Amino acid sequence: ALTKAEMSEYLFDKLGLSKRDAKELVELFFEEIRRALENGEQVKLSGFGNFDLRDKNQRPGRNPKTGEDIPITARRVVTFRPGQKLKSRVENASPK
DNA sequence: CCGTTTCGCTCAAGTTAGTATATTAAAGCTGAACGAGAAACGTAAAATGATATAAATATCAATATATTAAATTAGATTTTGCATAAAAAACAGACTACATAATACTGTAAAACACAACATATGCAGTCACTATGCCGAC
Numbered sequence: 001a002l003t004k005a006e007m008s009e010y011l012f013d014k015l016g017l018s019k020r021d022a023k024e025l026v027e028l029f030f031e032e033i034r035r036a037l038e039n040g041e042q043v044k045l046s047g048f049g050n051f052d053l054r055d056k057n058q059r060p061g062r063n064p065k066t067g068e069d070i071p072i073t074a075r076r077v078v079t080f081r082p083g084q085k086l087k088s089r090v091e092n093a094s095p096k
Numbered sequence: 097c098c099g100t101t102t103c104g105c106t107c108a109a110g111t112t113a114g115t116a117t118a119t120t121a122a123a124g125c126t127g128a129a130c131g132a133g134a135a136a137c138g139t140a141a142a143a144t145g146a147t148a149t150a151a152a153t154a155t156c157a158a159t160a161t162a163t164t165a166a167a168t169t170a171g172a173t174t175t176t177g178c179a180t181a182a183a184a185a186a187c188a189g190a191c192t193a194c195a196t197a198a199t200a201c202t203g204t205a206a207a208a209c210a211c212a213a214c215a216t217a218t219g220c221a222g223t224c225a226c227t228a229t230g231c232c233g234a235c
Binding site: 056070 | 142143144155156157158159160164165166167
Protein backbone atom coordinates (compact mmCIF):
# COMPACT_ATOMS: atom_id res chain seq x y z
CA ALA A 1 0.00 0.00 0.00
CA LEU A 2 1.33 3.42 -1.02
CA THR A 3 2.51 5.27 2.08
CA LYS A 4 4.69 8.14 3.31
CA ALA A 5 7.85 6.03 3.09
CA GLU A 6 7.29 5.11 -0.56
CA MET A 7 6.20 8.64 -1.48
CA SER A 8 9.40 10.12 -0.03
CA GLU A 9 11.55 7.55 -1.83
CA TYR A 10 9.73 8.45 -5.04
CA LEU A 11 10.52 12.17 -4.94
CA PHE A 12 14.08 11.11 -4.10
CA ASP A 13 14.91 9.21 -7.29
CA LYS A 14 12.51 11.32 -9.36
CA LEU A 15 13.11 14.98 -8.53
CA GLY A 16 16.57 14.34 -7.14
CA LEU A 17 15.64 15.87 -3.80
CA SER A 18 17.38 14.92 -0.56
CA LYS A 19 15.69 12.40 1.74
CA ARG A 20 15.39 15.24 4.25
CA ASP A 21 13.36 17.70 2.18
CA ALA A 22 11.48 14.83 0.55
CA LYS A 23 10.34 13.26 3.82
CA GLU A 24 9.38 16.77 4.95
CA LEU A 25 7.34 17.69 1.86
CA VAL A 26 5.27 14.50 2.04
CA GLU A 27 4.34 15.39 5.62
CA LEU A 28 3.57 19.06 4.94
CA PHE A 29 1.53 17.91 1.94
CA PHE A 30 -1.12 16.09 3.97
CA GLU A 31 -0.66 18.49 6.88
CA GLU A 32 -1.70 21.54 4.86
CA ILE A 33 -4.75 19.62 3.64
CA ARG A 34 -5.87 18.83 7.19
CA ARG A 35 -5.34 22.45 8.22
CA ALA A 36 -7.75 23.45 5.45
CA LEU A 37 -10.35 20.84 6.40
CA GLU A 38 -10.24 21.63 10.12
CA ASN A 39 -10.67 25.34 9.41
CA GLY A 40 -13.76 24.60 7.35
CA GLU A 41 -12.23 25.19 3.92
CA GLN A 42 -12.83 22.93 0.93
CA VAL A 43 -9.97 21.11 -0.81
CA LYS A 44 -10.38 21.06 -4.59
CA LEU A 45 -7.51 19.06 -6.09
CA SER A 46 -7.88 19.12 -9.88
CA GLY A 47 -7.32 15.72 -11.46
CA PHE A 48 -7.61 13.88 -8.16
CA GLY A 49 -10.82 14.75 -6.34
CA ASN A 50 -12.31 17.00 -3.67
CA PHE A 51 -12.45 16.95 0.13
CA ASP A 52 -15.88 18.21 1.18
CA LEU A 53 -17.13 18.86 4.72
CA ARG A 54 -20.73 17.99 5.55
CA ASP A 55 -22.38 18.63 8.92
CA LYS A 56 -24.45 15.56 9.79
CA ASN A 57 -27.39 15.89 12.18
CA GLN A 58 -28.06 13.52 15.09
CA ARG A 59 -29.74 10.49 13.52
CA PRO A 60 -31.01 7.20 15.05
CA GLY A 61 -28.51 4.37 15.41
CA ARG A 62 -27.99 1.19 17.42
CA ASN A 63 -25.69 -1.58 18.66
CA PRO A 64 -24.77 -3.74 15.62
CA LYS A 65 -24.06 -6.65 17.98
CA THR A 66 -27.01 -6.80 20.38
CA GLY A 67 -29.48 -4.35 18.87
CA GLU A 68 -29.84 -1.52 21.38
CA ASP A 69 -30.96 1.63 19.57
CA ILE A 70 -28.54 4.45 20.40
CA PRO A 71 -28.72 7.92 18.76
CA ILE A 72 -25.60 8.84 16.79
CA THR A 73 -24.51 12.30 17.92
CA ALA A 74 -24.17 14.92 15.19
CA ARG A 75 -20.69 15.62 13.83
CA ARG A 76 -18.78 17.13 10.91
CA VAL A 77 -17.15 14.33 8.91
CA VAL A 78 -14.89 14.63 5.87
CA THR A 79 -15.85 13.17 2.49
CA PHE A 80 -14.03 12.59 -0.80
CA ARG A 81 -15.59 13.03 -4.24
CA PRO A 82 -13.28 11.46 -6.87
CA GLY A 83 -13.12 13.53 -10.05
CA GLN A 84 -14.08 12.18 -13.46
CA LYS A 85 -10.42 12.13 -14.47
CA LEU A 86 -9.25 9.89 -11.63
CA LYS A 87 -12.35 7.71 -11.87
CA SER A 88 -11.57 6.85 -15.50
CA ARG A 89 -8.10 5.73 -14.41
CA VAL A 90 -9.58 3.42 -11.78
CA GLU A 91 -12.52 1.98 -13.71
CA ASN A 92 -10.63 -0.89 -15.34
CA ALA A 93 -8.47 -1.40 -12.25
CA SER A 94 -7.53 -4.72 -10.65
CA PRO A 95 -7.01 -5.51 -6.93
CA LYS A 96 -3.39 -6.48 -6.29
C1' DC B 97 -15.17 124.69 -3.12
C1' DC B 98 -10.63 125.96 -6.13
C1' DG B 99 -6.14 128.38 -6.45
C1' DT B 100 -1.47 129.30 -4.75
C1' DT B 101 2.66 128.32 -2.16
C1' DT B 102 5.27 125.49 0.74
C1' DC B 103 6.99 120.79 1.61
C1' DG B 104 7.87 115.88 0.93
C1' DC B 105 10.60 113.20 -3.01
C1' DT B 106 13.63 111.69 -6.28
C1' DC B 107 17.27 112.73 -9.84
C1' DA B 108 22.10 114.44 -10.50
C1' DA B 109 26.88 115.58 -9.18
C1' DG B 110 30.37 115.98 -5.45
C1' DT B 111 32.53 114.10 -0.42
C1' DT B 112 33.50 109.98 2.69
C1' DA B 113 33.46 105.33 5.06
C1' DG B 114 34.84 99.97 4.83
C1' DT B 115 36.81 95.55 3.88
C1' DA B 116 40.76 92.47 1.53
C1' DT B 117 41.94 86.53 -2.46
C1' DA B 118 43.67 82.84 -6.15
C1' DT B 119 44.39 78.07 -7.11
C1' DT B 120 44.57 73.76 -6.57
C1' DA B 121 42.43 68.98 -5.42
C1' DA B 122 38.11 66.02 -5.36
C1' DA B 123 33.64 65.87 -5.40
C1' DG B 124 28.40 66.20 -5.75
C1' DC B 125 23.97 67.26 -8.65
C1' DT B 126 21.03 65.88 -12.36
C1' DG B 127 18.95 65.72 -17.51
C1' DA B 128 19.19 61.85 -20.86
C1' DA B 129 20.12 57.28 -23.23
C1' DC B 130 20.86 52.20 -22.18
C1' DG B 131 19.56 46.82 -20.96
C1' DA B 132 16.53 41.54 -18.72
C1' DG B 133 13.10 38.45 -15.64
C1' DA B 134 8.53 37.65 -13.54
C1' DA B 135 3.49 38.13 -13.26
C1' DA B 136 -0.97 40.09 -14.59
C1' DC B 137 -3.93 39.46 -19.11
C1' DG B 138 -6.56 37.01 -22.43
C1' DT B 139 -8.49 33.72 -25.90
C1' DA B 140 -9.02 28.81 -26.12
C1' DA B 141 -9.50 24.17 -24.37
C1' DA B 142 -10.34 20.77 -20.61
C1' DA B 143 -12.55 19.60 -16.20
C1' DT B 144 -16.57 20.55 -13.49
C1' DG B 145 -20.92 22.71 -11.87
C1' DA B 146 -26.09 22.30 -13.41
C1' DT B 147 -30.19 19.05 -12.58
C1' DA B 148 -33.25 15.52 -10.92
C1' DT B 149 -35.35 10.46 -9.09
C1' DA B 150 -36.21 5.61 -8.01
C1' DA B 151 -32.80 2.20 -7.13
C1' DA B 152 -28.10 1.16 -5.45
C1' DT B 153 -24.61 2.10 -2.05
C1' DA B 154 -22.67 4.46 1.92
C1' DT B 155 -23.85 6.29 6.59
C1' DC B 156 -22.16 4.49 11.64
C1' DA B 157 -23.09 2.97 16.71
C1' DA B 158 -20.60 -0.81 20.23
C1' DT B 159 -17.25 -4.72 20.73
C1' DA B 160 -14.74 -9.21 19.64
C1' DT B 161 -10.67 -10.80 16.94
C1' DA B 162 -7.28 -11.70 13.18
C1' DT B 163 -4.20 -8.67 10.35
C1' DT B 164 -0.49 -5.16 9.03
C1' DA B 165 1.67 -0.98 7.84
C1' DA B 166 5.88 1.38 9.94
C1' DA B 167 7.74 4.16 13.41
C1' DT B 168 11.23 2.58 16.84
C1' DT B 169 15.04 1.01 17.66
C1' DA B 170 19.71 -1.55 17.30
C1' DG B 171 23.43 -3.40 15.20
C1' DA B 172 25.77 -3.70 10.63
C1' DT B 173 28.37 -1.33 6.68
C1' DT B 174 28.78 1.47 2.62
C1' DT B 175 29.76 6.21 2.42
C1' DT B 176 32.30 10.40 3.37
C1' DG B 177 35.77 13.82 5.02
C1' DC B 178 41.09 14.23 5.13
C1' DA B 179 45.77 13.45 4.57
C1' DT B 180 50.29 10.89 4.37
C1' DA B 181 53.90 9.63 1.21
C1' DA B 182 56.16 7.64 -2.58
C1' DA B 183 56.27 6.43 -7.51
C1' DA B 184 56.54 9.23 -11.61
C1' DA B 185 56.87 13.33 -14.38
C1' DA B 186 57.79 18.24 -14.78
C1' DC B 187 61.57 21.68 -15.09
C1' DA B 188 65.08 24.88 -13.42
C1' DG B 189 70.30 24.40 -12.97
C1' DA B 190 74.53 23.29 -16.09
C1' DC B 191 77.23 22.71 -20.74
C1' DT B 192 78.97 21.40 -24.87
C1' DA B 193 77.45 21.27 -29.57
C1' DC B 194 75.36 23.81 -33.65
C1' DA B 195 73.47 27.16 -36.63
C1' DT B 196 73.10 32.30 -36.65
C1' DA B 197 73.42 37.54 -36.31
C1' DA B 198 76.57 41.82 -35.13
C1' DT B 199 80.81 42.79 -36.15
C1' DA B 200 86.11 42.76 -38.20
C1' DC B 201 88.32 43.75 -42.51
C1' DT B 202 89.57 43.50 -47.48
C1' DG B 203 88.09 44.27 -52.44
C1' DT B 204 85.69 47.21 -56.25
C1' DA B 205 82.31 49.75 -58.91
C1' DA B 206 80.15 54.27 -59.07
C1' DA B 207 77.16 57.86 -57.14
C1' DA B 208 77.31 63.14 -56.52
C1' DC B 209 79.19 67.58 -57.75
C1' DA B 210 82.92 71.37 -58.50
C1' DC B 211 85.08 73.45 -62.38
C1' DA B 212 85.42 75.52 -67.13
C1' DA B 213 84.65 76.85 -72.00
C1' DC B 214 80.65 77.60 -75.01
C1' DA B 215 75.91 77.91 -77.01
C1' DT B 216 71.58 80.53 -76.98
C1' DA B 217 66.79 80.73 -75.87
C1' DT B 218 64.40 83.99 -72.97
C1' DG B 219 63.51 87.59 -69.72
C1' DC B 220 64.59 92.09 -69.36
C1' DA B 221 65.52 96.71 -71.69
C1' DG B 222 63.45 100.46 -74.50
C1' DT B 223 59.65 102.51 -77.61
C1' DC B 224 55.01 102.69 -80.09
C1' DA B 225 50.22 101.08 -80.76
C1' DC B 226 45.84 99.02 -78.86
C1' DT B 227 41.33 100.70 -76.68
C1' DA B 228 38.18 104.24 -74.63
C1' DT B 229 36.57 107.80 -71.79
C1' DG B 230 38.79 111.76 -69.20
C1' DC B 231 39.81 117.04 -69.20
C1' DC B 232 38.65 120.85 -71.48
C1' DG B 233 35.25 123.38 -74.37
C1' DA B 234 30.56 124.18 -75.75
C1' DC B 235 25.58 123.55 -74.66
